[PDB]
Amino acid sequence: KHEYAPRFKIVQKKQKGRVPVRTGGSIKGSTLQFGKYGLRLKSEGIRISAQQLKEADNAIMRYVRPLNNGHLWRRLCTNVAVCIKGNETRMGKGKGGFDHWMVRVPTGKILFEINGDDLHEKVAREAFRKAGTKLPGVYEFVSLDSLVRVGLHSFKNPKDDPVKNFYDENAKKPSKKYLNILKSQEPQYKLFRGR
Amino acid sequence: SRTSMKDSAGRRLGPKKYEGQDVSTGEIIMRQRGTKFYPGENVGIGKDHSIFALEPGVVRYYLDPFHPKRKFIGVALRRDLKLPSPHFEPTVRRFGRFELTNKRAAYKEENSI
RNA sequence: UAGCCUUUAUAAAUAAUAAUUAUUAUAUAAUAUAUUAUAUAAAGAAUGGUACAGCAAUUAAUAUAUAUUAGGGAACUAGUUUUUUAAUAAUAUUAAAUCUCGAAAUAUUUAAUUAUAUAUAAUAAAGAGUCAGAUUAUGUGCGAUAAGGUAAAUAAUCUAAAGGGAAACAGCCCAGAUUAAGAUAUAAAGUUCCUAAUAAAUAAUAAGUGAAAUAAAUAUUAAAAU
RNA sequence: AAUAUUUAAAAUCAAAUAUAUAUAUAUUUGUUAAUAGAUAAUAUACGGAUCUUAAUAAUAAGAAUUAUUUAAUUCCUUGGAAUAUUAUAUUUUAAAAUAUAAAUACUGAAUAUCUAAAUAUUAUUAUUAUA
RNA sequence: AUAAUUGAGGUCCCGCAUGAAUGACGUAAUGAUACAACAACUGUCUCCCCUUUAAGCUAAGUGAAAUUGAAAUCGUAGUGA
RNA sequence: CAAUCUCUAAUUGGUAGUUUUGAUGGUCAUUAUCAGCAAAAGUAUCUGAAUAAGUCCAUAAAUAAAUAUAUAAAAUU
RNA sequence: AUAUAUUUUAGUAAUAGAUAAAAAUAUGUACAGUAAAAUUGUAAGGAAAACAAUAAUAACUUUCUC
RNA sequence: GAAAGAAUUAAAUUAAUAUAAUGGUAUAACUGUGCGAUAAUUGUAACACAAACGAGUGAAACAAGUACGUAAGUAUGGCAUAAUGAACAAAUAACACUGAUUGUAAAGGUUAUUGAUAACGAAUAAAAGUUACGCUAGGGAAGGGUAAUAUAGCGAAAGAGUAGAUAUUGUAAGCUAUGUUUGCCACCUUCGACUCAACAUUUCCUCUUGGUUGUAAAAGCUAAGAAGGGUUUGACUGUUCGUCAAUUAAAAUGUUACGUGAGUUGGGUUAAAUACGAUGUGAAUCAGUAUGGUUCCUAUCUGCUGAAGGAAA
RNA sequence: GGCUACGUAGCUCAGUUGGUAGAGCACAUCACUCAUAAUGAUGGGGUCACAGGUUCGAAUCCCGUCGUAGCCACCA
Ligand SMILES: [Mg+2]
Ligand SMILES: [Mg+2]
Ligand SMILES: [Mg+2]
Ligand SMILES: [Mg+2]
Ligand SMILES: [Mg+2]
Ligand SMILES: [Mg+2]
Ligand SMILES: [Mg+2]
Ligand SMILES: [Mg+2]
Ligand SMILES: [Mg+2]
Ligand SMILES: [Mg+2]
Ligand SMILES: [Mg+2]
Ligand SMILES: [Mg+2]
Ligand SMILES: [Mg+2]
Ligand SMILES: [Mg+2]
Ligand SMILES: [Mg+2]
Ligand SMILES: [Mg+2]
Ligand SMILES: [Mg+2]
Ligand SMILES: [Mg+2]
Ligand SMILES: [Mg+2]
Ligand SMILES: [Mg+2]
Ligand SMILES: [Mg+2]
Ligand SMILES: [Mg+2]
Ligand SMILES: [Mg+2]
Ligand SMILES: [Mg+2]
Ligand SMILES: [Mg+2]
Ligand SMILES: [Mg+2]
Ligand SMILES: [Mg+2]
Ligand SMILES: [Mg+2]
Ligand SMILES: [Mg+2]
Ligand SMILES: [Mg+2]
Ligand SMILES: [Mg+2]
Ligand SMILES: [Mg+2]
Ligand SMILES: [Mg+2]
Ligand SMILES: [Mg+2]
Ligand SMILES: [Mg+2]
Ligand SMILES: [Mg+2]
Ligand SMILES: [Mg+2]
Ligand SMILES: [Mg+2]
Ligand SMILES: [Mg+2]
Ligand SMILES: [Mg+2]
Ligand SMILES: [Mg+2]
Ligand SMILES: [Mg+2]
Ligand SMILES: [Mg+2]
Ligand SMILES: [Mg+2]
Ligand SMILES: [Mg+2]
Ligand SMILES: [Mg+2]
Ligand SMILES: [Mg+2]
Ligand SMILES: [Mg+2]
Ligand SMILES: [Mg+2]
Ligand SMILES: [Mg+2]
Ligand SMILES: [Mg+2]
Ligand SMILES: [Mg+2]
């Protein structure tokens, strides 16, 4: 509903920033969560405007609405407010006025997701290709079995990466603050703190 | 047009004296906005929460179990002392005065009340 | 005026610059469950909150044949069910210059030790010039993730630096001309000829692709792996 | 053969290094190409020539492009050893045997060394005449 | 009005932003004023040709000038304050 | 009266000497807070601010609260 | 029971607690305590007036008691 | 087993803080309450932080006095970071320091206090415009870069096309090229006509060819090759352009310092004169209108057009 | 920072050299009339501008602030 037009109460101008190249191997929003088939970015990290996203959504919908129990999950919201000065105006003299909403999209991230009752995968693939024709990146069809993109030419299965109880790890190799707390909890300090 | 071209300078609010550093009485160990560091052993605190040394010694940053979730800056009277000092041991104190070996000076001091 | 430069000197002078030690844990050995030594591992005294990472709280976004709160319809005889409309909850998933609960490296930075003394800091007495900067790389603000653009941050060079390379070249890659000499090591860059110097190996290309200034979505044809 | 993906060393396998060690653990490395798309005004414009190989047939050429490498090739631990190569000499019948060598690729600065000369400072001397 | 007119004259009045001695309006005459039309005329032009004289050119005599870092002073492309 | 001299006042582009900031098409110039600012400190531009400041707050809630009531004392009665 | 005199009371006014998030003295010092939101209710009361309620007691001290 | 106390643990700084925002604050810096109303006091302040100077900030300690607290102790205003202004000249007090011959005085000094210079390190007590009649010293304290726009192309194809997205058409969004427009940057300080044109091809005509239920024919439409040759004359306007008239096989689009002023012109743009409308108190002014109106050059080199001499043939 | 002199009713204005709530003015009802309205009469609201003293007795004098502005000072 509000993914292409956030309702920040205090509307305000924003700096340009940069699209996060996720050097640490994030895989956040790079996985199929809601649907069966999806459309992910394949190229270098890119900014997608609100209008472009809307058009992609519309393109996808043409295939989704005919389906029985058809659904489209829009995975990303255009949260960054972009202002622009005109091409007509000189440089300097303040910042330009609000123009459009935009989203910073890392390399591996999923944009859309679909799942119908009577949805064959070929149709879904076609729809997602047609959606990609309207967006500024280069995109890729992603199924539930197809594995998570991280880099431009690199891949990963989330099933593989290890599970860890971090409290236990902390206890094993404790910080100074934690040790101080533990000492405080002990009786030769707790009795004589005198509050 | 109307531009937002106005800002105060930076308040120089780092630590002004470091761990293991020799100090003198009066010297500022920390400038800060509110007690990020609390005044520890042999150390005072000012109006602007500025930690300053009460005695000559060695600046030490530490945690104390009595005050968990609070960082401290204190001044150890020597380099030998671990400055979160043992609680039930006697306080390491500085006399900090000198006897008036000079006779006249001693006499003057005796006279003065 | 300070910053940076110069001259002459001063010491109960190393205070300077660089690194190490400093911590945590493990194993072994020796003393009294602790201490010391040895070895190994760990981005390893103190200060920090950027990258990264994250969705906690704040601010934002999405979904539920899930629950509650009311509303609009609807079927039988005000009660009731369903298809729901919003809010709230629950569960799952997401991001931000002014969010950071996790969190680097570089950094700031302390003592002693070692190494730099044909070397540094500090102080004293005196002379300046300069206050139009430029480019390259990285991280940003503005611009349109435009400018040989603009604004500052860090480093280098040019400025004021000749020499070799980059065809030619202020700012790039090497390297700092006291005067020669030209045997030996070379730097960056090169070795068919122009032009100082070359031979091999294994693959791929057939397009003069390309051969020191890489042009995109997409299409076609192959090639591998499943 | 056919259909449909992916173009990957994360997983997986293979290979190598480091800790107890014929194994385990940890780390490091290995996963497409071509063409089209293609484009303006003095004149082709990799700096230019020119470079893509070919038996018969050479004491002889066969990328001068792209990618990964080496300094003849293969094992052992920069070094030695073996292997064939190449060149040469000797002996025997243009070939065979023996042995010697080459294997340090090279060019390259106003860099460094060497080789000499000058000035300045530091530290030692020698000669001649605040010695 | 012209084959055809952003010009000219006539007329209309959302006069962006006329107006009465910073005078208002309509005429006769005048004007090397400005714009437009008709007639006549023509080398203005279609489209230039021929001719004449003074230069230009050559020989003799006299004899400038601005300019000038030094010049042994080509094209193209590239580079580059 | 008026004229002249001396003093005093009004008026003056008549006339003379001067000036017309730095930044911009009325707005910005001093101070504070955050971001920009890249985990010390500092850090700019006609950069972004739901930006904020030229202050505000005081002489006041008092007095009374142990020898007391008739009579007699004054070792506390 | 009633008259006069002399007194006494009635000026009727909130805090009764070291008060603790209604409003009021904004700098000192001493002593003490904890807010808010949301939720469930309740006369007018309704989304929005007020009041109530809404985390855990292991160990310790004293008291009574099987 | 029960009651009461002491409390501890968890949570919380989301409330509250005189006031912005940030940091801090429950050990509370927040809140209540007693006393008080004092420390919102007086002389010396080292040493630090910050820092060009001027200033700014924290502050141990010594001495005098005060308030609260049993005491320990705490208080030199406010949880902190804003809340501001130099000298000079005046003014008011206190000080007992100087007292221009001596004594008084005046006047000056010391100490405390006063009002502003916001262009906020403040030039004076006190200062606005105009010039196209201008003057001097200097500085530059279309080309180049860019490609948002513009022009052209490509991919994908919603949708028109009597039916069929792709004969022809092709929304909004996607990927490029160009340097032909309007911009931006600031390294770098004249429009049109005439004359002669050279080059490009993204081709308007002519030649060849593919597609065209939308090629029967003929006219077309669209696309590929193709730059050999050719591609206008008039009315209006300074105009390029545009409107129209009459033609043409066609009347293509650019580049060349938007080719060409040491080749011509000078209508536009343009200074001095003048008027009009508007603006201004005015001098005068204008992304206004109108009439008038100033540059010249014998060619040294390059280059090109022709013509000779010398030369090695 | 000091010094003035003014601020009555919804409108306008008296009153002022003391022993006062008064006027016509626009506004709503009756009235003469064929029907308006001019004219005749109904009544209307003032803390005599916030707010204190001297005379049994001040809207008027002595004023505590409030307001309109005006003036001086300071203007370095
Ligand atoms: Mg992120
Ligand atoms: Mg700051
Ligand atoms: Mg200087
Ligand atoms: Mg040292
Ligand atoms: Mg930040
Ligand atoms: Mg943190
Ligand atoms: Mg840093
Ligand atoms: Mg400068
Ligand atoms: Mg200069
Ligand atoms: Mg620059
Ligand atoms: Mg210079
Ligand atoms: Mg240098
Ligand atoms: Mg050079
Ligand atoms: Mg040198
Ligand atoms: Mg080529
Ligand atoms: Mg190239
Ligand atoms: Mg691996
Ligand atoms: Mg070319
Ligand atoms: Mg080359
Ligand atoms: Mg040398
Ligand atoms: Mg007409
Ligand atoms: Mg005409
Ligand atoms: Mg007009
Ligand atoms: Mg008149
Ligand atoms: Mg007149
Ligand atoms: Mg005349
Ligand atoms: Mg020559
Ligand atoms: Mg004048
Ligand atoms: Mg911060
Ligand atoms: Mg900062
Ligand atoms: Mg910082
Ligand atoms: Mg806070
Ligand atoms: Mg410093
Ligand atoms: Mg100073
Ligand atoms: Mg406070
Ligand atoms: Mg307080
Ligand atoms: Mg002055
Ligand atoms: Mg005298
Ligand atoms: Mg100024
Ligand atoms: Mg100033
Ligand atoms: Mg002035
Ligand atoms: Mg004029
Ligand atoms: Mg250009
Ligand atoms: Mg259709
Ligand atoms: Mg389009
Ligand atoms: Mg063509
Ligand atoms: Mg036909
Ligand atoms: Mg031909
Ligand atoms: Mg031109
Ligand atoms: Mg010329
Ligand atoms: Mg006029
Ligand atoms: Mg004339």
Short mmCIF file of C-alpha atoms (C1' of nucleotides) in Angstrom, two decimals, chain I residues 9-61:
data_model
loop_
_atom_site.label_atom_id
_atom_site.label_comp_id
_atom_site.label_asym_id
_atom_site.label_seq_id
_atom_site.Cartn_x
_atom_site.Cartn_y
_atom_site.Cartn_z
"C1'" A I 9 -22.38 56.13 27.65
"C1'" G I 10 -22.79 51.58 22.00
"C1'" C I 11 -21.79 56.99 18.85
"C1'" U I 12 -20.74 62.58 19.61
"C1'" C I 13 -20.01 65.29 23.43
"C1'" A I 14 -21.06 67.97 28.21
"C1'" G I 15 -19.21 68.92 32.30
"C1'" U I 16 -14.22 72.40 34.17
"C1'" U I 17 -12.74 78.11 38.58
"C1'" G I 18 -16.04 71.43 44.06
"C1'" G I 19 -22.13 70.84 47.72
"C1'" U I 20 -25.19 66.69 39.24
"C1'" A I 21 -25.25 60.87 35.83
"C1'" G I 22 -27.70 65.22 32.25
"C1'" A I 23 -27.83 66.43 26.36
"C1'" G I 24 -29.30 65.57 21.81
"C1'" C I 25 -27.30 61.39 18.57
"C1'" A I 26 -27.79 56.66 14.95
"C1'" C I 27 -30.78 52.28 17.02
"C1'" A I 28 -36.17 48.82 18.43
"C1'" U I 29 -42.19 49.77 19.80
"C1'" C I 30 -46.44 52.59 19.48
"C1'" A I 31 -48.54 57.77 16.78
"C1'" C I 32 -51.18 61.35 12.88
"C1'" U I 33 -51.99 58.72 7.34
"C1'" C I 34 -54.90 56.19 1.10
"C1'" A I 35 -49.41 54.10 1.98
"C1'" U I 36 -44.28 55.16 3.11
"C1'" A I 37 -41.20 58.55 5.45
"C1'" A I 38 -40.16 63.39 7.72
"C1'" U I 39 -41.88 65.06 12.54
"C1'" G I 40 -44.45 64.10 17.94
"C1'" A I 41 -43.10 60.34 22.80
"C1'" U I 42 -41.72 55.31 24.68
"C1'" G I 43 -37.50 53.89 27.26
"C1'" G I 44 -32.55 52.00 26.64
"C1'" G I 45 -26.48 52.26 28.99
"C1'" G I 46 -22.49 55.19 32.21
"C1'" U I 47 -18.36 51.47 38.20
"C1'" C I 48 -18.26 59.71 35.28
"C1'" A I 49 -10.57 55.79 32.34
"C1'" C I 50 -7.48 51.24 36.40
"C1'" A I 51 -7.71 52.76 41.73
"C1'" G I 52 -6.11 55.03 47.01
"C1'" G I 53 -6.30 60.12 50.69
"C1'" U I 54 -7.69 65.52 52.83
"C1'" U I 55 -13.49 68.43 53.75
"C1'" C I 56 -20.41 64.96 57.48
"C1'" G I 57 -19.28 66.16 51.78
"C1'" A I 58 -14.04 65.99 45.44
"C1'" A I 59 -16.22 62.52 38.58
"C1'" U I 60 -13.28 68.04 39.83
"C1'" C I 61 -7.40 68.58 44.28
#
